[PDB]
Amino acid sequence: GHMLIPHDLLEADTLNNLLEDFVTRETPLDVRVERARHALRRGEAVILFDPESQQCQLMLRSEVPAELLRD
């Protein structure tokens, strides 16, 4: 914790950088990024934000503890 922040609230460049990080955490990069953007639209990937550190990370909902999806 770490809070959830909707992707559509994000500055476009920071979102692109988060998407690229995630898919590199063979299909071209851009295709993988588009698959991740769809996953964000379907709510099957989410973005976690840490108040201190002020850092963001894209994660699969399935890898997020329930405590951090209550929010």
PDB file of N, CA, C and O in Angstrom:
ATOM      1  N   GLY A   1       0.802  -1.276   0.000  1.00  0.00           N
ATOM      2  CA  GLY A   1       0.000   0.000   0.000  1.00  0.00           C
ATOM      3  C   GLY A   1       0.811   1.290   0.000  1.00  0.00           C
ATOM      4  O   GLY A   1       1.463   1.627   1.023  1.00  0.00           O
ATOM      5  N   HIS A   2       0.754   2.042  -1.091  1.00  0.00           N
ATOM      6  CA  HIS A   2       0.202   1.587  -2.358  1.00  0.00           C
ATOM      7  C   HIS A   2      -1.310   1.661  -2.471  1.00  0.00           C
ATOM      8  O   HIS A   2      -2.027   0.920  -1.811  1.00  0.00           O
ATOM      9  N   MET A   3      -1.773   2.587  -3.308  1.00  0.00           N
ATOM     10  CA  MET A   3      -3.182   2.727  -3.663  1.00  0.00           C
ATOM     11  C   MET A   3      -3.369   2.516  -5.168  1.00  0.00           C
ATOM     12  O   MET A   3      -2.441   2.685  -5.944  1.00  0.00           O
ATOM     13  N   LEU A   4      -4.580   2.157  -5.565  1.00  0.00           N
ATOM     14  CA  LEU A   4      -4.943   2.089  -6.968  1.00  0.00           C
ATOM     15  C   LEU A   4      -5.261   3.455  -7.548  1.00  0.00           C
ATOM     16  O   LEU A   4      -5.946   4.247  -6.925  1.00  0.00           O
ATOM     17  N   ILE A   5      -4.775   3.708  -8.756  1.00  0.00           N
ATOM     18  CA  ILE A   5      -5.123   4.898  -9.517  1.00  0.00           C
ATOM     19  C   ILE A   5      -5.594   4.541 -10.951  1.00  0.00           C
ATOM     20  O   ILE A   5      -4.901   3.788 -11.678  1.00  0.00           O
ATOM     21  N   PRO A   6      -6.775   5.040 -11.352  1.00  0.00           N
ATOM     22  CA  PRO A   6      -7.265   4.657 -12.676  1.00  0.00           C
ATOM     23  C   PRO A   6      -6.297   5.121 -13.774  1.00  0.00           C
ATOM     24  O   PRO A   6      -5.817   6.245 -13.722  1.00  0.00           O
ATOM     25  N   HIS A   7      -6.051   4.263 -14.769  1.00  0.00           N
ATOM     26  CA  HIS A   7      -5.113   4.560 -15.867  1.00  0.00           C
ATOM     27  C   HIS A   7      -5.422   5.865 -16.622  1.00  0.00           C
ATOM     28  O   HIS A   7      -4.501   6.574 -17.049  1.00  0.00           O
ATOM     29  N   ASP A   8      -6.720   6.166 -16.750  1.00  0.00           N
ATOM     30  CA  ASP A   8      -7.213   7.349 -17.481  1.00  0.00           C
ATOM     31  C   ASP A   8      -6.989   8.658 -16.716  1.00  0.00           C
ATOM     32  O   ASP A   8      -7.149   9.741 -17.263  1.00  0.00           O
ATOM     33  N   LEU A   9      -6.554   8.535 -15.468  1.00  0.00           N
ATOM     34  CA  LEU A   9      -6.178   9.699 -14.675  1.00  0.00           C
ATOM     35  C   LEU A   9      -4.703  10.036 -14.945  1.00  0.00           C
ATOM     36  O   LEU A   9      -4.261  11.124 -14.605  1.00  0.00           O
ATOM     37  N   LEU A  10      -3.965   9.128 -15.594  1.00  0.00           N
ATOM     38  CA  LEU A  10      -2.513   9.277 -15.744  1.00  0.00           C
ATOM     39  C   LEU A  10      -2.064  10.142 -16.900  1.00  0.00           C
ATOM     40  O   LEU A  10      -2.651  10.175 -17.981  1.00  0.00           O
ATOM     41  N   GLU A  11      -0.993  10.848 -16.612  1.00  0.00           N
ATOM     42  CA  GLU A  11      -0.256  11.628 -17.598  1.00  0.00           C
ATOM     43  C   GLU A  11       0.179  10.647 -18.715  1.00  0.00           C
ATOM     44  O   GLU A  11       0.714   9.569 -18.421  1.00  0.00           O
ATOM     45  N   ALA A  12      -0.066  10.979 -19.985  1.00  0.00           N
ATOM     46  CA  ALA A  12       0.095   9.971 -21.059  1.00  0.00           C
ATOM     47  C   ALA A  12       1.483   9.336 -21.171  1.00  0.00           C
ATOM     48  O   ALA A  12       1.608   8.116 -21.388  1.00  0.00           O
ATOM     49  N   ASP A  13       2.531  10.134 -20.969  1.00  0.00           N
ATOM     50  CA  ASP A  13       3.899   9.613 -21.040  1.00  0.00           C
ATOM     51  C   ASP A  13       4.278   8.743 -19.871  1.00  0.00           C
ATOM     52  O   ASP A  13       5.010   7.781 -20.053  1.00  0.00           O
ATOM     53  N   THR A  14       3.859   9.112 -18.670  1.00  0.00           N
ATOM     54  CA  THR A  14       4.156   8.229 -17.584  1.00  0.00           C
ATOM     55  C   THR A  14       3.398   6.907 -17.834  1.00  0.00           C
ATOM     56  O   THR A  14       3.969   5.886 -17.633  1.00  0.00           O
ATOM     57  N   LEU A  15       2.157   6.941 -18.323  1.00  0.00           N
ATOM     58  CA  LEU A  15       1.440   5.672 -18.619  1.00  0.00           C
ATOM     59  C   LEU A  15       2.190   4.792 -19.642  1.00  0.00           C
ATOM     60  O   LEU A  15       2.253   3.575 -19.495  1.00  0.00           O
ATOM     61  N   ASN A  16       2.773   5.419 -20.669  1.00  0.00           N
ATOM     62  CA  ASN A  16       3.490   4.661 -21.731  1.00  0.00           C
ATOM     63  C   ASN A  16       4.681   3.967 -21.203  1.00  0.00           C
ATOM     64  O   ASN A  16       4.913   2.807 -21.546  1.00  0.00           O
ATOM     65  N   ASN A  17       5.427   4.687 -20.358  1.00  0.00           N
ATOM     66  CA  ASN A  17       6.589   4.172 -19.660  1.00  0.00           C
ATOM     67  C   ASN A  17       6.194   3.011 -18.714  1.00  0.00           C
ATOM     68  O   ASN A  17       6.872   2.006 -18.668  1.00  0.00           O
ATOM     69  N   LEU A  18       5.120   3.176 -17.947  1.00  0.00           N
ATOM     70  CA  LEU A  18       4.598   2.062 -17.083  1.00  0.00           C
ATOM     71  C   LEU A  18       4.218   0.807 -17.939  1.00  0.00           C
ATOM     72  O   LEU A  18       4.490  -0.325 -17.542  1.00  0.00           O
ATOM     73  N   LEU A  19       3.575   1.035 -19.095  1.00  0.00           N
ATOM     74  CA  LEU A  19       3.170  -0.076 -19.978  1.00  0.00           C
ATOM     75  C   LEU A  19       4.376  -0.820 -20.519  1.00  0.00           C
ATOM     76  O   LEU A  19       4.420  -2.036 -20.484  1.00  0.00           O
ATOM     77  N   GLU A  20       5.376  -0.064 -20.999  1.00  0.00           N
ATOM     78  CA  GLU A  20       6.636  -0.621 -21.479  1.00  0.00           C
ATOM     79  C   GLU A  20       7.376  -1.376 -20.389  1.00  0.00           C
ATOM     80  O   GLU A  20       7.804  -2.526 -20.629  1.00  0.00           O
ATOM     81  N   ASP A  21       7.480  -0.793 -19.180  1.00  0.00           N
ATOM     82  CA  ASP A  21       8.074  -1.516 -18.030  1.00  0.00           C
ATOM     83  C   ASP A  21       7.387  -2.848 -17.820  1.00  0.00           C
ATOM     84  O   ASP A  21       8.031  -3.882 -17.696  1.00  0.00           O
ATOM     85  N   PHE A  22       6.066  -2.832 -17.821  1.00  0.00           N
ATOM     86  CA  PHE A  22       5.260  -4.031 -17.472  1.00  0.00           C
ATOM     87  C   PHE A  22       5.514  -5.129 -18.465  1.00  0.00           C
ATOM     88  O   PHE A  22       5.782  -6.264 -18.086  1.00  0.00           O
ATOM     89  N   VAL A  23       5.436  -4.824 -19.745  1.00  0.00           N
ATOM     90  CA  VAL A  23       5.549  -5.886 -20.758  1.00  0.00           C
ATOM     91  C   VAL A  23       6.989  -6.374 -20.961  1.00  0.00           C
ATOM     92  O   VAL A  23       7.225  -7.392 -21.619  1.00  0.00           O
ATOM     93  N   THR A  24       7.951  -5.679 -20.359  1.00  0.00           N
ATOM     94  CA  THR A  24       9.287  -6.215 -20.346  1.00  0.00           C
ATOM     95  C   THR A  24       9.724  -6.679 -18.961  1.00  0.00           C
ATOM     96  O   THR A  24      10.857  -7.094 -18.806  1.00  0.00           O
ATOM     97  N   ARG A  25       8.803  -6.670 -17.986  1.00  0.00           N
ATOM     98  CA  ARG A  25       9.108  -7.029 -16.575  1.00  0.00           C
ATOM     99  C   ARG A  25       9.802  -8.389 -16.380  1.00  0.00           C
ATOM    100  O   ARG A  25       9.587  -9.320 -17.163  1.00  0.00           O
ATOM    101  N   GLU A  26       9.253 -13.386 -31.880  1.00  0.00           N
ATOM    102  CA  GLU A  26       8.771 -12.695 -30.676  1.00  0.00           C
ATOM    103  C   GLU A  26       7.775 -11.550 -31.042  1.00  0.00           C
ATOM    104  O   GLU A  26       7.984 -10.795 -31.991  1.00  0.00           O
ATOM    105  N   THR A  27       6.683 -11.436 -30.301  1.00  0.00           N
ATOM    106  CA  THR A  27       5.714 -10.358 -30.530  1.00  0.00           C
ATOM    107  C   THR A  27       6.381  -8.985 -30.363  1.00  0.00           C
ATOM    108  O   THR A  27       7.076  -8.773 -29.394  1.00  0.00           O
ATOM    109  N   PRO A  28       6.179  -8.046 -31.305  1.00  0.00           N
ATOM    110  CA  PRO A  28       6.758  -6.712 -31.149  1.00  0.00           C
ATOM    111  C   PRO A  28       6.298  -6.006 -29.879  1.00  0.00           C
ATOM    112  O   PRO A  28       5.156  -6.239 -29.413  1.00  0.00           O
ATOM    113  N   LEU A  29       7.146  -5.108 -29.374  1.00  0.00           N
ATOM    114  CA  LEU A  29       6.863  -4.298 -28.183  1.00  0.00           C
ATOM    115  C   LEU A  29       5.509  -3.623 -28.201  1.00  0.00           C
ATOM    116  O   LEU A  29       4.768  -3.673 -27.208  1.00  0.00           O
ATOM    117  N   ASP A  30       5.247  -2.928 -29.296  1.00  0.00           N
ATOM    118  CA  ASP A  30       4.050  -2.170 -29.454  1.00  0.00           C
ATOM    119  C   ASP A  30       2.750  -3.024 -29.375  1.00  0.00           C
ATOM    120  O   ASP A  30       1.770  -2.569 -28.817  1.00  0.00           O
ATOM    121  N   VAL A  31       2.775  -4.227 -29.953  1.00  0.00           N
ATOM    122  CA  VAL A  31       1.697  -5.184 -29.836  1.00  0.00           C
ATOM    123  C   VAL A  31       1.473  -5.609 -28.342  1.00  0.00           C
ATOM    124  O   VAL A  31       0.339  -5.704 -27.843  1.00  0.00           O
ATOM    125  N   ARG A  32       2.558  -5.915 -27.680  1.00  0.00           N
ATOM    126  CA  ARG A  32       2.485  -6.285 -26.269  1.00  0.00           C
ATOM    127  C   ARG A  32       1.931  -5.143 -25.434  1.00  0.00           C
ATOM    128  O   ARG A  32       1.147  -5.380 -24.538  1.00  0.00           O
ATOM    129  N   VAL A  33       2.330  -3.902 -25.746  1.00  0.00           N
ATOM    130  CA  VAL A  33       1.846  -2.722 -25.062  1.00  0.00           C
ATOM    131  C   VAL A  33       0.333  -2.579 -25.308  1.00  0.00           C
ATOM    132  O   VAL A  33      -0.423  -2.256 -24.383  1.00  0.00           O
ATOM    133  N   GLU A  34      -0.106  -2.795 -26.561  1.00  0.00           N
ATOM    134  CA  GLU A  34      -1.538  -2.676 -26.852  1.00  0.00           C
ATOM    135  C   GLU A  34      -2.359  -3.755 -26.114  1.00  0.00           C
ATOM    136  O   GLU A  34      -3.481  -3.478 -25.696  1.00  0.00           O
ATOM    137  N   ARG A  35      -1.816  -4.951 -26.008  1.00  0.00           N
ATOM    138  CA  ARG A  35      -2.453  -6.008 -25.249  1.00  0.00           C
ATOM    139  C   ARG A  35      -2.563  -5.569 -23.784  1.00  0.00           C
ATOM    140  O   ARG A  35      -3.566  -5.794 -23.127  1.00  0.00           O
ATOM    141  N   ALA A  36      -1.523  -4.917 -23.265  1.00  0.00           N
ATOM    142  CA  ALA A  36      -1.568  -4.436 -21.861  1.00  0.00           C
ATOM    143  C   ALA A  36      -2.594  -3.272 -21.647  1.00  0.00           C
ATOM    144  O   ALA A  36      -3.229  -3.145 -20.592  1.00  0.00           O
ATOM    145  N   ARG A  37      -2.728  -2.398 -22.639  1.00  0.00           N
ATOM    146  CA  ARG A  37      -3.679  -1.318 -22.595  1.00  0.00           C
ATOM    147  C   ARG A  37      -5.119  -1.859 -22.564  1.00  0.00           C
ATOM    148  O   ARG A  37      -5.974  -1.256 -21.939  1.00  0.00           O
ATOM    149  N   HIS A  38      -5.367  -2.902 -23.338  1.00  0.00           N
ATOM    150  CA  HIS A  38      -6.679  -3.586 -23.337  1.00  0.00           C
ATOM    151  C   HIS A  38      -6.951  -4.186 -21.949  1.00  0.00           C
ATOM    152  O   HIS A  38      -8.067  -4.082 -21.433  1.00  0.00           O
ATOM    153  N   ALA A  39      -5.930  -4.828 -21.388  1.00  0.00           N
ATOM    154  CA  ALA A  39      -5.988  -5.438 -20.048  1.00  0.00           C
ATOM    155  C   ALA A  39      -6.326  -4.334 -19.018  1.00  0.00           C
ATOM    156  O   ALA A  39      -7.163  -4.554 -18.118  1.00  0.00           O
ATOM    157  N   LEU A  40      -5.750  -3.116 -19.193  1.00  0.00           N
ATOM    158  CA  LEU A  40      -6.096  -1.976 -18.290  1.00  0.00           C
ATOM    159  C   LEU A  40      -7.549  -1.544 -18.467  1.00  0.00           C
ATOM    160  O   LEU A  40      -8.311  -1.309 -17.446  1.00  0.00           O
ATOM    161  N   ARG A  41      -7.964  -1.459 -19.744  1.00  0.00           N
ATOM    162  CA  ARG A  41      -9.383  -1.186 -20.049  1.00  0.00           C
ATOM    163  C   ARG A  41     -10.362  -2.247 -19.489  1.00  0.00           C
ATOM    164  O   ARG A  41     -11.493  -1.917 -19.083  1.00  0.00           O
ATOM    165  N   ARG A  42      -9.953  -3.499 -19.495  1.00  0.00           N
ATOM    166  CA  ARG A  42     -10.825  -4.590 -18.945  1.00  0.00           C
ATOM    167  C   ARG A  42     -10.717  -4.722 -17.384  1.00  0.00           C
ATOM    168  O   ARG A  42     -11.379  -5.578 -16.745  1.00  0.00           O
ATOM    169  N   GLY A  43      -9.878  -3.901 -16.787  1.00  0.00           N
ATOM    170  CA  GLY A  43      -9.556  -3.985 -15.355  1.00  0.00           C
ATOM    171  C   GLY A  43      -8.832  -5.228 -14.911  1.00  0.00           C
ATOM    172  O   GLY A  43      -8.787  -5.517 -13.706  1.00  0.00           O
ATOM    173  N   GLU A  44      -8.208  -5.943 -15.850  1.00  0.00           N
ATOM    174  CA  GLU A  44      -7.439  -7.148 -15.519  1.00  0.00           C
ATOM    175  C   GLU A  44      -5.970  -6.866 -15.190  1.00  0.00           C
ATOM    176  O   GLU A  44      -5.312  -7.713 -14.643  1.00  0.00           O
ATOM    177  N   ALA A  45      -5.511  -5.644 -15.534  1.00  0.00           N
ATOM    178  CA  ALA A  45      -4.272  -4.994 -15.016  1.00  0.00           C
ATOM    179  C   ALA A  45      -4.741  -3.716 -14.379  1.00  0.00           C
ATOM    180  O   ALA A  45      -5.756  -3.175 -14.785  1.00  0.00           O
ATOM    181  N   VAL A  46      -4.033  -3.301 -13.325  1.00  0.00           N
ATOM    182  CA  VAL A  46      -4.328  -2.105 -12.583  1.00  0.00           C
ATOM    183  C   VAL A  46      -3.002  -1.371 -12.335  1.00  0.00           C
ATOM    184  O   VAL A  46      -1.893  -1.907 -12.640  1.00  0.00           O
ATOM    185  N   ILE A  47      -3.122  -0.141 -11.828  1.00  0.00           N
ATOM    186  CA  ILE A  47      -1.954   0.638 -11.485  1.00  0.00           C
ATOM    187  C   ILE A  47      -1.955   0.936  -9.999  1.00  0.00           C
ATOM    188  O   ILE A  47      -2.891   1.504  -9.496  1.00  0.00           O
ATOM    189  N   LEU A  48      -0.883   0.537  -9.352  1.00  0.00           N
ATOM    190  CA  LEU A  48      -0.646   0.818  -7.961  1.00  0.00           C
ATOM    191  C   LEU A  48       0.270   2.030  -7.774  1.00  0.00           C
ATOM    192  O   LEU A  48       1.307   2.159  -8.411  1.00  0.00           O
ATOM    193  N   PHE A  49      -0.125   2.890  -6.867  1.00  0.00           N
ATOM    194  CA  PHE A  49       0.643   4.093  -6.562  1.00  0.00           C
ATOM    195  C   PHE A  49       1.029   4.170  -5.074  1.00  0.00           C
ATOM    196  O   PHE A  49       0.177   3.962  -4.238  1.00  0.00           O
ATOM    197  N   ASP A  50       2.306   4.465  -4.801  1.00  0.00           N
ATOM    198  CA  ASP A  50       2.853   4.596  -3.446  1.00  0.00           C
ATOM    199  C   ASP A  50       3.039   6.079  -3.108  1.00  0.00           C
ATOM    200  O   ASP A  50       3.891   6.718  -3.673  1.00  0.00           O
ATOM    201  N   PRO A  51       2.212   6.620  -2.209  1.00  0.00           N
ATOM    202  CA  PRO A  51       2.261   7.979  -1.618  1.00  0.00           C
ATOM    203  C   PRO A  51       3.678   8.505  -1.379  1.00  0.00           C
ATOM    204  O   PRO A  51       4.025   9.601  -1.847  1.00  0.00           O
ATOM    205  N   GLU A  52       4.465   7.726  -0.653  1.00  0.00           N
ATOM    206  CA  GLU A  52       5.883   7.992  -0.422  1.00  0.00           C
ATOM    207  C   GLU A  52       6.665   7.163  -1.431  1.00  0.00           C
ATOM    208  O   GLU A  52       6.334   6.020  -1.679  1.00  0.00           O
ATOM    209  N   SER A  53       7.727   7.728  -1.969  1.00  0.00           N
ATOM    210  CA  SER A  53       8.378   7.221  -3.176  1.00  0.00           C
ATOM    211  C   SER A  53       7.669   7.821  -4.364  1.00  0.00           C
ATOM    212  O   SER A  53       8.291   8.027  -5.387  1.00  0.00           O
ATOM    213  N   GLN A  54       6.380   8.142  -4.195  1.00  0.00           N
ATOM    214  CA  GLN A  54       5.505   8.659  -5.268  1.00  0.00           C
ATOM    215  C   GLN A  54       5.532   7.811  -6.540  1.00  0.00           C
ATOM    216  O   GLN A  54       5.114   8.256  -7.599  1.00  0.00           O
ATOM    217  N   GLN A  55       6.004   6.571  -6.410  1.00  0.00           N
ATOM    218  CA  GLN A  55       6.213   5.679  -7.544  1.00  0.00           C
ATOM    219  C   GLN A  55       4.935   4.867  -7.922  1.00  0.00           C
ATOM    220  O   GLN A  55       4.123   4.532  -7.085  1.00  0.00           O
ATOM    221  N   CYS A  56       4.799   4.590  -9.219  1.00  0.00           N
ATOM    222  CA  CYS A  56       3.692   3.833  -9.804  1.00  0.00           C
ATOM    223  C   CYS A  56       4.211   2.527 -10.324  1.00  0.00           C
ATOM    224  O   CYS A  56       5.387   2.410 -10.746  1.00  0.00           O
ATOM    225  N   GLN A  57       3.322   1.545 -10.350  1.00  0.00           N
ATOM    226  CA  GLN A  57       3.613   0.327 -11.095  1.00  0.00           C
ATOM    227  C   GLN A  57       2.334  -0.359 -11.667  1.00  0.00           C
ATOM    228  O   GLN A  57       1.323  -0.456 -11.005  1.00  0.00           O
ATOM    229  N   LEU A  58       2.438  -0.828 -12.906  1.00  0.00           N
ATOM    230  CA  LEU A  58       1.394  -1.604 -13.521  1.00  0.00           C
ATOM    231  C   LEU A  58       1.534  -3.041 -13.025  1.00  0.00           C
ATOM    232  O   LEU A  58       2.656  -3.546 -12.976  1.00  0.00           O
ATOM    233  N   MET A  59       0.412  -3.648 -12.618  1.00  0.00           N
ATOM    234  CA  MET A  59       0.384  -5.041 -12.138  1.00  0.00           C
ATOM    235  C   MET A  59      -0.876  -5.759 -12.661  1.00  0.00           C
ATOM    236  O   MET A  59      -1.918  -5.152 -12.840  1.00  0.00           O
ATOM    237  N   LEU A  60      -0.785  -7.057 -12.880  1.00  0.00           N
ATOM    238  CA  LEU A  60      -1.978  -7.878 -13.107  1.00  0.00           C
ATOM    239  C   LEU A  60      -2.804  -7.900 -11.797  1.00  0.00           C
ATOM    240  O   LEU A  60      -2.258  -8.059 -10.713  1.00  0.00           O
ATOM    241  N   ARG A  61      -4.079  -7.638 -11.910  1.00  0.00           N
ATOM    242  CA  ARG A  61      -5.036  -7.738 -10.760  1.00  0.00           C
ATOM    243  C   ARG A  61      -4.805  -9.034  -9.973  1.00  0.00           C
ATOM    244  O   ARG A  61      -4.898  -9.024  -8.768  1.00  0.00           O
ATOM    245  N   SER A  62      -4.539 -10.137 -10.690  1.00  0.00           N
ATOM    246  CA  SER A  62      -4.305 -11.475 -10.122  1.00  0.00           C
ATOM    247  C   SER A  62      -3.061 -11.567  -9.229  1.00  0.00           C
ATOM    248  O   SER A  62      -2.983 -12.417  -8.348  1.00  0.00           O
ATOM    249  N   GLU A  63      -2.100 -10.664  -9.430  1.00  0.00           N
ATOM    250  CA  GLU A  63      -0.890 -10.596  -8.588  1.00  0.00           C
ATOM    251  C   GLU A  63      -0.948  -9.614  -7.404  1.00  0.00           C
ATOM    252  O   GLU A  63      -0.017  -9.522  -6.571  1.00  0.00           O
ATOM    253  N   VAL A  64      -2.056  -8.899  -7.325  1.00  0.00           N
ATOM    254  CA  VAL A  64      -2.281  -7.936  -6.282  1.00  0.00           C
ATOM    255  C   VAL A  64      -2.986  -8.600  -5.064  1.00  0.00           C
ATOM    256  O   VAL A  64      -4.002  -9.280  -5.233  1.00  0.00           O
ATOM    257  N   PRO A  65      -2.403  -8.416  -3.835  1.00  0.00           N
ATOM    258  CA  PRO A  65      -3.080  -8.831  -2.622  1.00  0.00           C
ATOM    259  C   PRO A  65      -4.459  -8.243  -2.475  1.00  0.00           C
ATOM    260  O   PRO A  65      -4.655  -7.063  -2.778  1.00  0.00           O
ATOM    261  N   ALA A  66      -5.388  -9.019  -1.895  1.00  0.00           N
ATOM    262  CA  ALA A  66      -6.772  -8.540  -1.801  1.00  0.00           C
ATOM    263  C   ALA A  66      -6.853  -7.211  -1.059  1.00  0.00           C
ATOM    264  O   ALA A  66      -7.675  -6.365  -1.395  1.00  0.00           O
ATOM    265  N   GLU A  67      -6.019  -7.067  -0.022  1.00  0.00           N
ATOM    266  CA  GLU A  67      -5.953  -5.856   0.789  1.00  0.00           C
ATOM    267  C   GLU A  67      -5.721  -4.584  -0.061  1.00  0.00           C
ATOM    268  O   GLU A  67      -6.249  -3.551   0.240  1.00  0.00           O
ATOM    269  N   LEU A  68      -4.969  -4.713  -1.136  1.00  0.00           N
ATOM    270  CA  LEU A  68      -4.660  -3.599  -2.068  1.00  0.00           C
ATOM    271  C   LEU A  68      -5.660  -3.426  -3.249  1.00  0.00           C
ATOM    272  O   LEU A  68      -5.520  -2.496  -4.061  1.00  0.00           O
ATOM    273  N   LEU A  69      -6.652  -4.315  -3.353  1.00  0.00           N
ATOM    274  CA  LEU A  69      -7.727  -4.197  -4.345  1.00  0.00           C
ATOM    275  C   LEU A  69      -9.052  -3.696  -3.724  1.00  0.00           C
ATOM    276  O   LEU A  69      -9.991  -3.318  -4.450  1.00  0.00           O
ATOM    277  N   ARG A  70      -9.083  -3.702  -2.384  1.00  0.00           N
ATOM    278  CA  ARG A  70     -10.078  -3.016  -1.518  1.00  0.00           C
ATOM    279  C   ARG A  70      -9.732  -1.547  -1.377  1.00  0.00           C
ATOM    280  O   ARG A  70      -8.807  -1.209  -0.629  1.00  0.00           O
ATOM    281  N   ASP A  71     -10.487  -0.682  -2.066  1.00  0.00           N
ATOM    282  CA  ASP A  71      -9.964   0.625  -2.499  1.00  0.00           C
ATOM    283  C   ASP A  71     -10.768   1.143  -3.718  1.00  0.00           C
ATOM    284  O   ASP A  71     -10.387   0.930  -4.891  1.00  0.00           O
TER     285      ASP A  71
END
